[PDB]
Amino acid sequence: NAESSLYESLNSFKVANRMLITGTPLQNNIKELAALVNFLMPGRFTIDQE
DNA sequence: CGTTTAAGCGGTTGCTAGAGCTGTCTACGACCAATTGAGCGGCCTCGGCACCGGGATTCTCCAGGGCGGCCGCGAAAAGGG
Fold it and tell me: A24 CA, B18 C1': separation in Å?
């Protein structure tokens, strides 16, 4: 969730390199993957269409 | 003061309620004219309460009739010269 408080807590960190460990990248909709790749690549990926 | 527990915070996941906006239309209420009947005042009359005259009803008082007690009075029986 992009609006969850952990997203703004972690996205404001001054970090050069990030990495996400999970087992289920897609759960409900493409917006979850869009939020994950925006946390990874800020502004490079522009997934908007459902 | 020791211990447990539930509030607080963050999180999911979908649907529904509700605010906001735009659009249409239709029944509903404002408005006006003519009308009239329900509200306010007075006027008249009866129901009931009350006042006055007349008649029927019961209680109190004054007088007559009869009986008891006194007032010496008077005829009569017994005693004395």
Answer: 36
